[PDB]
Every structure is written in C-alpha cells, then in structure tokens.
C-alpha cells in the first residue's frame, strides 16, 4: 500500500507485490512489478535502492513496516514500459560475501556475534542457542557459515533457529511466533501430502573423530521397516552428540500441506508456527501476492520432517 | 493462440531460475 523507496512513494505505480520466503531461502524476497511512465522514469530507480513496504498489519490493523530491504535487481521492458524489481533484505549480502574463519569450540550465538562484529552488521540481542559446537574451519559465505553452525546446533539437541534481517539482524527461533493463526477458516484449497520419501527409521553413526564412537539407534524399525542412514560427520566427537544427532534425524517421511488461503495473513513468515484444523505446523514456505485482491499460499510441515530435511 | 507458449516458457524459466537462486 505504501512503497517508500528513498524519498518518494511509488505505491501509485505498482501492478502487484509478491512477498515470498523459504525456510532455507537466502533472504525474505519481495518482487514488486511497476509500470514506468515518465514520472517513475525521472527518479531513476537503481539497484541498491532501499525499499520499505508498509501495509495494514493483520494483528492490530496499524500501518507497520512488513518489509525493509534493498533492491537487488531491476529489469526494465522498453516496448511496454514495465519496470520490475526483485527486492531482498540485507541477508542477501551475507550470502554473497565469502570469508574464511577458524573457530574453536563454542556456541552458535557467539559465532554469529563474531560475524556481525567483524562485518559491522547491526543485530538485536541474539538468543542463546546453548548448544556447543566443535572446532571447524569455514570458507563458504557468511550466511552459509551461519546456516552450517545452526544446522550443527539443531543436531546435538539444540532448538531450530533461523536468521532474518529486518532492520537489524535477528536470530529467530522457529516455534516462537506471537500469534498462532488458524488457516482453516480461509482455506481456499489444501493438499495434504504424506510419504516415506525422506523417512529415517535407523541411523548407523560411524565417527570419523574420537571422543571410536559407533552405534545404531533405530527408533521405529518394527513399524516402517529399517529405513537406515549413515551419519559420518567429523563434528560428532562424542557419544551423547551421536545419540542426539540420531534422535534429531528420525521421522515418518515427508508430511506437508500445500495450503492456499483466500486472505493474505500479512505477518506470516518462514518458520512461524501456524494451525490448520486442530493440528499445528511450521511454515516451510510462504508466498504472499498482494494483487488487487490480497492472497496467500503456504507450504507447512511437521517438526520432525523439517529437522530431518533442512537440518 | 500462440503467445501462450512464449508466456509460459518465460514463466517456467523465471520460476526455475528463481528457485535455484533462492535455495542455492
């Protein structure tokens, strides 16, 4: 409804906005399509411009900044003067800037604070993930390093954390959204899919590092059969770490719902805890599309499958 | 009658490229 840019208000030009995020996505993504007459052409929107989308929030019905990022790419058509943007929050910067860091044994929160301090990234008070990580040397992107240590934190019994940018970097635990919205009331169509596609019933740990930690921790072998994996990570250097990694991998296969909603719940985001029918599910992916009729589509799943796949 | 092919090839290319860039 309001698109601030730097100074102007280009909400008087946009054909539609689509706010999309994935649980493992690089960044909260806003793809706003505009018509580009002389008026919009004058201001000369370039890549790197700062877009802030403001719309009436679902919670309190007050205008709140639902998106605050930067224009990552502009594509302009000439025959039809339709300028199209693809906005990203500043976690896209972290996913592109490579750097090598050597880390001793420590927790994920300390590592994230170290990254932010090194690269001068503003950040709120980061939640203590608690889990203690093994010494590693990293080379991938900063977001890649953060995701790697968060995955290793999900292993060893730690809670599932996800990093979202907003104005200043936030360490967002998955099941900690304020409002557990119920989608059954506006359920245009749902697609309950169940499978054994990524089911894990057994896991045979073969430790590449010593405390000779080896074991098997089959959990539902009698019911679904011995759907076995082999976890052979150097980071597992402990018997309890092996047991917790095994326990953080068992699941009954893929179990998700491809939900389609006729009303756009504005504040939904990846990782949020949302209800369909009596059950509760975590948002694997959300794709708003703020056309003339607000609309939302969701892909949600159980905790076990999400932990198995994305962690 | 024929522009559907161009439109939806563009949609397929955009969607797959978009997904690869996001997840990758």
């Amino acid at each position: 409804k309001i698109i601030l840019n730097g100074k102007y208000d280009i909400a008087n030009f946009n054909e539609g906005i689509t706010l999309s995020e994935a649980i493992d996505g690089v960044a909260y993504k806003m793809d706003v399509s505009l018509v580009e007459p002389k008026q919009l052409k004058d201001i000369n929107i370039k890549k790197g411009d700062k877009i802030i989308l403001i719309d009436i929030a679902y919670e309190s019905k007050k205008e709140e900044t639902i998106f605050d990022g930067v224009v990552w790419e502009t594509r302009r058509s000439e025959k039809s003067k339709k300028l199209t943007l693809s906005c990203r929050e500043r976690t896209v910067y972290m996913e592109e800037s490579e750097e090598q860091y050597q880390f001793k044994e420590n927790t994920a929160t300390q590592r994230i604070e170290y990254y932010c301090k090194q690269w001068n990234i503003p950040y709120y008070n980061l939640a203590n993930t608690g889990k203690k990580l093994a010494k590693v040397i990293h080379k991938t992107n900063i977001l890649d390093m953060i995701k790697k240590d968060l995955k290793e934190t999900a292993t060893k019994g730690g809670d599932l954390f996800r990093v979202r940018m907003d104005n200043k970097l936030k360490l967002f635990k998955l099941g900690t959204n304020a409002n557990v919205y119920k989608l059954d009331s506006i359920l245009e169509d749902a697609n309950f899919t169940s499978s054994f596609n990524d089911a894990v019933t057994s896991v045979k740990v073969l430790g590449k590092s010593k405390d000779p930690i080896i074991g098997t921790y089959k959990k539902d072998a009698d019911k679904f059969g011995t759907l076995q994996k082999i976890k052979q990570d150097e980071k597992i250097k402990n018997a309890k770490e092996a047991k917790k990694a095994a326990e953080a991998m068992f699941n009954s296969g893929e179990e998700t719902i491809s939900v389609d909603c006729a009303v756009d719940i504005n504040r939904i985001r990846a990782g949020d805890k949302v209800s369909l029918k009596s059950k509760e599910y975590y948002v694997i992916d959300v794709t708003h599309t703020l056309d003339s009729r607000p609309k939302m589509k969701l892909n949600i799943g159980s905790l076990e499958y999400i932990r198995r796949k994305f962690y | 009658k024929e522009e559907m092919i161009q439109e939806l090839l563009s949609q397929v290319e955009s969607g797959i490229r978009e997904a690869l860039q996001d997840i990758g």
Binding site: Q100, Q102, I137, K139, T140 | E13, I16, R17, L20, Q21, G24
Partner: protein, 56 residues
C-alpha cells in the same frame, strides 16, 4: 534456458569446491605463531605430527 544451465553449473562448482575443502594433503610452513598451511588465512596453533619427526 541457458541461464538456468549456467546457474546450475555455478552450483556444481560451488558444491564441489565446498566438498573438496578440508581434505587431502597440503603444503605448509612452520612459524613461531604455529603451523602455517598454504591456502589458509590463519595459522593452526594446535596440530599433530608423526612420531618420527619428534626425534631429539
């Protein structure tokens, strides 16, 4: 569709490079700070050696 192929090939190189990192023999030099391995930004202050290198 060439853009998808190029992006996917970039992903091939990315994944292969990440997998090959931290593996295989590498050259190095000893310093007062500690071991200095070629291709590493920081010196390794804790490392192992073969016992035949510990001779008086």
């Amino acid at each position: 569709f060439n853009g998808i192929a190029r992006i996917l090939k970039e992903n091939m190189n990315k994944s292969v490079a990440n997998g090959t990192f931290g593996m295989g023999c590498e050259l190095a030099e000893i310093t007062a700070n500690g071991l200095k391995v070629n291709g590493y930004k920081d010196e390794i202050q804790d490392y192992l050696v073969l016992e035949n290198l510990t001779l008086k």
